[PDB]
């Protein structure tokens, strides 16, 4: 199996929709790699359309929590939660191949959530707290101010790898190191 073979090579794949199950798989892999060697850098390849904000914050907390550094390499697309996780890597070791996508926007609810107006007010304050927490994470990880993140992630802010490096989501664009 290639996933296990790269797991022995300290490589994690954030390759599916970011839900609680994929979040727990990524957290278990990160904790295993941290218990194995807490100094060697954990490589996280990110090709994901995102998902829930709680799974996003779980993976972010586990990436910042492990003693090993997280080299997040974005491939293809890091939308919604995967772009915040891509910026959540170790500063100076955040990579993305040149044709990868970075989609940053405010968190949204998957469908309609019904209830009384007090419960709707609570859910609205909670998604506003989610938006503020995502903006604070992107401000602390990209070097920008939270207000610039707030205007930019007001709608779908879509960037390339270079555009994400100028934005601060990644710290280096990875060249093609093919020998030919």
């Amino acid at each position: 199996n290639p996933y296990n073979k790269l797991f022995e090579e300290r490589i994690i794949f954030l390759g599916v929709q970011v839900d609680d199950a994929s979040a727990n798989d990524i957290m278990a892999q990160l904790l295993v790699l941290e218990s194995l060697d807490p100094d060697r850098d954990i490589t996280m390849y990110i090709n994901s359309p995102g998902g829930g904000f709680t799974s996003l914050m779980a993976i972010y907390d586990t990436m910042q929590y492990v003693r090993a550094d997280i080299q997040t390499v974005c491939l293809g697309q890091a939308a919604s939660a995967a772009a915040v996780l891509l910026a959540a890597g170790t500063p100076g070791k955040r990579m993305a191949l040149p044709n990868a996508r970075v989609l940053i926007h405010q968190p949204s609810l998957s469908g309609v959530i019904q209830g009384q107006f007090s419960d709707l007010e609570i859910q609205a304050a909670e998604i506003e707290r989610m938006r503020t927490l995502m903006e604070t994470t992107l401000a602390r990880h990209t070097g920008k101010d939270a207000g610039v993140i707030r205007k930019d992630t007001d709608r779908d802010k879509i960037l390339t790898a270079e555009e994400a490096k100028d934005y601060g989501i990644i710290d280096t664009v990875l060249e093609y190191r093919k020998l030919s």
Binding site: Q116, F117, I127, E128
Partner: protein, 178 residues
């Protein structure tokens, strides 16, 4: 249709019916009936019998505005069930002419609804829901004569009233008894 036939025959006698969930279509039907009865005779009472499980606020807002702006005095009749927009439109009647049948059940609770879209869209919906709830509670305080804080504390969840309980609260002014 027999139901439409007896409805038009009671409309000729100035008796309209809020007999379903208050959606925009039934609301426009009721406002059209109110406007027709006001164009026929602006001095005779319009009897609105309300048996409704609730519905839309906008629809209820349209029915309420048509009730107040019609020169006729809208006598509302709580008939069996007045929940949500039913009780709001029942208490919206003319003071001294709001009635409850002796076994009607009146349900006053905070407006309900749904949030969707992005975080800014849900925040805008939050401002709109807060304004809607404040307007509905101020109007219910205007109707029942109760303070707005008591209205909001009681309609935080489902609040039930019988005929005598709604007469004591202020949704209706008399209890029809023979």
């Amino acid at each position: 249709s027999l139901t439409d036939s007896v409805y038009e025959r009671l409309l000729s006698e100035r008796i309209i019916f809020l007999g379903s969930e208050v959606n925009d279509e039934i609301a426009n039907r009721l406002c059209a009936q109110i406007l027709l009865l006001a164009a026929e005779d602006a001095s005779k009472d319009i009897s609105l019998y309300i048996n409704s499980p609730g519905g839309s606020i906008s629809a209820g807002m349209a029915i309420y505005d048509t009730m107040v702006l019609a020169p006729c005095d809208i006598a509302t009749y709580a008939m069996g069930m007045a929940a949500s927009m039913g009780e709001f439109l029942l208490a919206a009647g003319t003071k001294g002419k709001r009635y409850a049948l002796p076994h009607a059940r009146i349900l006053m609770h905070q407006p309900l609804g749904g949030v969707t879209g992005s975080a800014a869209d849900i925040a805008i919906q939050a401002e709109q829901f807060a304004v809607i709830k404040k307007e509905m509670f101020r109007l219910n305080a205007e109707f029942t004569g109760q303070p707005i804080e008591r209205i909001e504390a009681d309609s935080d969840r489902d609040r039930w009233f019988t005929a005598a309980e709604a007469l004591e609260y202020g949704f209706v002014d008399h209890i029809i008894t023979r």
